[PDB]
Amino acid sequence: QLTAAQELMIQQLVAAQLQVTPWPLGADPQSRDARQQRFAHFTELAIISVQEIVDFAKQVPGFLQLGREDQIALLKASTIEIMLLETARRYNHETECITFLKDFTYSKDDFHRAGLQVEFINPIFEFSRAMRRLGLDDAEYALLIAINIFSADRPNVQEPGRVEALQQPYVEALLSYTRIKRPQDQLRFPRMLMKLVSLRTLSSVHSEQVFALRLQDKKLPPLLSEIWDVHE
Numbered sequence: 518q519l520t521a522a523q524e525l526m527i528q529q530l531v532a533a534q535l536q537v538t539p540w541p542l543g544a545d546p547q548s549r550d551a552r553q554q555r556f557a558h559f560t561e562l563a564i565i566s567v568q569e570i571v572d573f574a575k576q577v578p579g580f581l582q583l584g585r586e587d588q589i590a591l592l593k594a595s596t597i598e599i600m601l602l603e604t605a606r607r608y609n610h611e612t613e614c615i616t617f618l619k620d621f622t623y624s625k626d627d628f629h630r631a632g633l634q635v636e637f638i639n640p641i642f643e644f645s646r647a648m649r650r651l652g653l654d655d656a657e658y659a660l661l662i663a664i665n666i667f668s669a670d671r672p673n674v675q676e677p678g679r680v681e682a683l684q685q686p687y688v689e690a691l692l693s694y695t696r697i698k699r700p701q702d703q704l705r706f707p708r709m710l711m712k713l714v715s716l717r718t719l720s721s722v723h724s725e726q727v728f729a730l731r732l733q734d735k736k737l738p739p740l741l742s743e744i745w746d747v748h749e
């Protein structure tokens with residue numbers, strides 16, 4: 518059984534988890550102004566997602582207690598990973614679209630029309646598609662978000678032992694939650710760890726998608742820019 522202390526951390530997380538420039542209508546796909554406006558749209562969707570991800574972290578017990586520079590380094594690393602996680606949650610398997618809202622849905626071709634490469638769009642859609650077979654519930658997603666944020670090995674983490682100590686009760690809760698929910702499915706927890714590793718691959722591919730877009734003269738807005746640009 519889950520201990521009281523685990524049922525409490527899950528509930529806080531779930532409760533905490535409860536808490537634009539228009540697509541260019543009928544513009545040519547080859548059109549450069551249209552490709553810029555599609556990019557700017559996604560960019561603005563993405564800005565609302567870091568906002569909500571930063572507001573969610575502030576509510577994870579311990580996070581605000583951490584070094585200001587560690588907060589930022591933890592948020593820097595995991596933003597794209599958490600966005601990817603959420604995209605998967607919201608994927609419409611009938612329609613083959615990542616949904617942001619409800620009338621805001623995007624196919625592979627939508628992303629291509631914004632100047633993105635198949636090298637990035639294909640693996641994001643495959644990850645979304647493969648997440649349904651895992652059948653995660655609210656609590657499992659939330660636990661996974663919290664463990665993703667408390668990753669001791671991110672670039673520029675100055676207090677990794679503190680970060681790991683904060684992670685452990687969440688990994689431990691997740692383990693026991695999976696054993697309770699699916700006693701017969703002993704591959705479930707390792708599958709969850711496998712997604713974490715996928716997220717680090719897709720975070721890396723996202724980074725080079727951002728770089729290539731710079732070579733096409735497409736610049737991220739300041740807020741996203743400080744998260745994702747490389748510069749020497």
Ligand SMILES: O=S(=O)(c1ccccc1)N(CC(F)(F)F)c1ccc(C(O)(C(F)(F)F)C(F)(F)F)cc1
Pocket residue numbers: 556558559560562563566600601604615617623633641723726727730737741
């Ligand atoms: O799901 S996203 O976060 C997303 C962003 C905006 C609108 C809808 C969905 N996303 C796809 C992913 F699967 F990776 F999560 C996404 C994130 C970031 C980007 C970009 O960084 C930018 F600039 F558009 F925001 C880029 F296009 F450069 F890759 C594009 C798509």
